[PDB]
From Swiss-Prot, chain B:
Gene Ontology biological process terms in this record: L-methionine salvage from methylthioadenosine
Enzyme class name: isomerase
Whole-protein residues included: 2 to 211 of 411
Protein's name according to its UniProt entry: Methylthioribose-1-phosphate isomerase
Keywords recorded for this protein, A-Z: Acetylation, Amino-acid biosynthesis, Cytoplasm, Isomerase, Methionine biosynthesis, Nucleus, Phosphoprotein
Organism per entry: Saccharomyces cerevisiae (strain ATCC 204508 / S288c)
Main location class: cytoplasm
Example of a GO cellular component annotation carried by this entry: nucleus
Site, as annotated: Transition state stabilizer: C180
Additional facts recorded: Present with 922 molecules/cell in log phase SD medium.
Pathway recorded for this protein: Amino-acid biosynthesis; L-methionine biosynthesis via salvage pathway; L-methionine from S-methyl-5-thio-alpha-D-ribose 1-phosphate: step 1/6
Annotated coiled-coil segments of the chain: none
N-acetylserine sites (modified residues): S1
Single GO term (MF): S-methyl-5-thioribose-1-phosphate isomerase activity
């Protein structure tokens, strides 16, 4: 029988949900995992000693035709999965269904302050020896470092839009929705 | 540890809510108390709470904490936004504050979906006391259905993939990719995509008992 | 006549060559530019107000068949360019040619210390007011912040391999090399 | 010059100076690291204080030259005591070993190996350290000057090629390009490879908008 043996979460710039939060939950649950850069998906697929057989993503808004707003990078992961023949699934509750908006082109996409891209928040590290810096009470300290010039313009969309053509299945509490022979999702039961 | 929102529901007329500051994880674990819709707006806008369902939950809870605060204390700063002697005038201000809360972050639809249901509950409420109790039941169910549905969809997805793999003749160990955070930190617990991963891991551990 | 009106450099995790170095050069030269996350290529293409018509990448090693080792993320960019029908060019001098190694699978790929992935280096930012923290001589202080749990394993290849099938042209001081009808580069003149 | 990865003062052929920008600290901090020996070359490459394929080859090559000039000028220096200077063959043995050490700094980019092979060929045809010194100086000047000239050539080749492709396809508008990593003056002797092409394209674009 097939079984899952490993998880490859993406760092997920710029907020770093993948490295700071997902990697944390995976360690907590003791699930075998290796964190990779967002840029490493293609090379990871090509070299993985364990075949990658699926990507699972969440959603922020699934509209009537199944087009999906999710974290910036999701469309890109979908494209890479298409190119490498890897099944790509959106996983989300009915509460994440928009039953009014018709298609992905009509979704409003938050763009965030450029400083959230140019400045990285993390726990302070000793730049000489690499240990955690602890405060008087022995606790880790939050710190920020700048990783780009003041002068550079940045693009900081919080989400991208994955068209339904790239989504193999939408997985919910009500079951798994897939496309009919016309390439259309039928989500009416979730409206 | 991994609980994004800490909701003490044990005293229904006087709930407490505090949230993990997700900006500071994983090395630093710090809570932000939620007392008003202002606090709700602020933790959402600044992404101290994030993840589509967790946003909807904290938003919804912030309405509860506000309503209970203005009940318990007509003189608090937030209360002075209301004329509490007059139910119609109060509903109006609530509705405006709900619109304010909505504007926190636009893209994920969960918040809007919850606030629509809350506006509907408010329209059927004869006074602030009735709204209070009904909002309490609503948010409790939002959270409880969120967790139970996370585990249901987790199982659905795991069963589905193993199914598809077995049919395609695949019989070996496999890996998966995931993005962002969709676990307990993004929801009421367990999560969505990470929930499927958690279900697949349970399936895997079970299978390597045999 | 067509003309380049904008550049979209990628951040280029984990070392941040893009955000720290390329963005600096573009600022210096006053070339209109918008820095983007590595994860943003696909969405950037779909939404760009100015059509993206090429990717230009460098190389670390081009072997006999044109297969190219370059910064991690290069393979990925080429795959995305393929999806979107955007020309993808490798640009390198003859000094970057390896005239012995036959193919990409034979390239040795450097993997670097995991701490170079999990810890981000940058200029210290004032937590109160967001300005640069400077030392007593007025110079910006370097700092490091950790963005992942100690316990999480990471994959940190410094390079990936882009197979010649994905490369539209190799641009050198001797001219632009393209594939023949059988899909092969003929780089002999560079050996 | 804020963008110059490697500052090579060649004005005294027998006594060159070399310092490099610490690219770990850019862009807000501009700090130079002196290069005196092959250990310095190895250190800045391995730590990625200098990086970029051609820059790696150039700093590596330069560090051999600073080393041989140092052992000439200070036979009592630490690095000099590694050498049995009384004997050319014995000297070459240690130099070759140190060239192999330098090579081991970072494996994937081939530029460094390509240069070290050439330096070894020069070493094998030099009759003594003095001759090697002179020929190595010539070699590094040529490596650097050709790197810059070829960066400009390839930049212009690539710019023209893309413009021609677009002109054939009847594209007449403003366009954008994508790039990755750093391939500019910080990665090379100056001007750059992929960023070179972008620089050439920008020159073409400025000419057009001026008109």
């Amino acid at each position: 029988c097939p079984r899952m043996g490993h998880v490859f979460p993406l760092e997920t710039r710029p907020y770093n949900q993948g490295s700071r939060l997902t990697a944390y939950e995976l360690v907590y649950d003791k699930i075998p995992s290796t964190l990779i850069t967002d840029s490493s998906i293609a090379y990871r697929i090509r070299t993985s000693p364990i075949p990658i057989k699926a990507a699972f993503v969440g959603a922020d808004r699934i509209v009537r035709n199944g087009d999906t707003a999710n974290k910036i990078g999701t469309l890109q992961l979908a494209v890479i999965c298409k190119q490498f023949g890897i099944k790509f699934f959106v996983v989300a509750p009915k509460t994440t269904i928009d039953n009014v908006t018709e298609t992905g082109d009509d979704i409003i996409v938050e763009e965030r302050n450029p400083e959230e891209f140019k400045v990285v928040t993390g726990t302070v590290i000793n730049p000489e020896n690499g240990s955690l810096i602890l405060n008087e009470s022995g606790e880790p300290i939050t710190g920020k470092v700048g990783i780009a010039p003041l002068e550079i313009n940045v693009w900081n969309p919080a989400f991208d839009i994955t068209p339904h053509e790239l989504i193999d299945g939408i997985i919910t509490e009500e079951g798994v929705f897939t496309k009919n022979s016309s390439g259309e999702f039928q989500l009416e039961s979730l409206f | 540890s991994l609980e994004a929102i800490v909701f003490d529901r044990s005293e229904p007329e006087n709930v407490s809510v505090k949230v993990l500051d997700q900006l500071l994880l994983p090395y630093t674990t710090k809570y932000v108390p939620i007392h008003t819709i202002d606090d709700g707006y602020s933790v959402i806008k600044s992404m101290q709470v994030r993840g589509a369902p967790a946003i909807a939950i904290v938003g919804s809870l912030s309405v509860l904490t506000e309503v209970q605060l203005i009940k318990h204390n007509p003189t608090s700063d937030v209360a002075t936004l209301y004329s509490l002697v007059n139910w119609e005038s109060t509903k109006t201000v609530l509705n405006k504050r709900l619109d304010f809360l909505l504007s926190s972050r636009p893209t994920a639809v969960n918040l809007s979906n919850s606030l629509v249901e809350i506006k509907n509950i408010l329209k059927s409420s004869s006074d602030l006391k009735a709204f209070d109790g009904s909002l309490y039941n609503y948010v409790c169910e939002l959270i409880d259905e969120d967790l139970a549905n996370n585990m249901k969809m987790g199982d659905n997805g795991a069963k589905y993939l193993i199914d598809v793999l077995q049919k395609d003749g695949f019989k070996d160990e496999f890996a998966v990719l995931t993005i962002c955070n969709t676990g307990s930190l993004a929801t009421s617990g367990y999560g969505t995509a990470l929930g499927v991963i958690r279900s697949l891991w349970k399936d895997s551990l079970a299978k390597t008992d045999k």
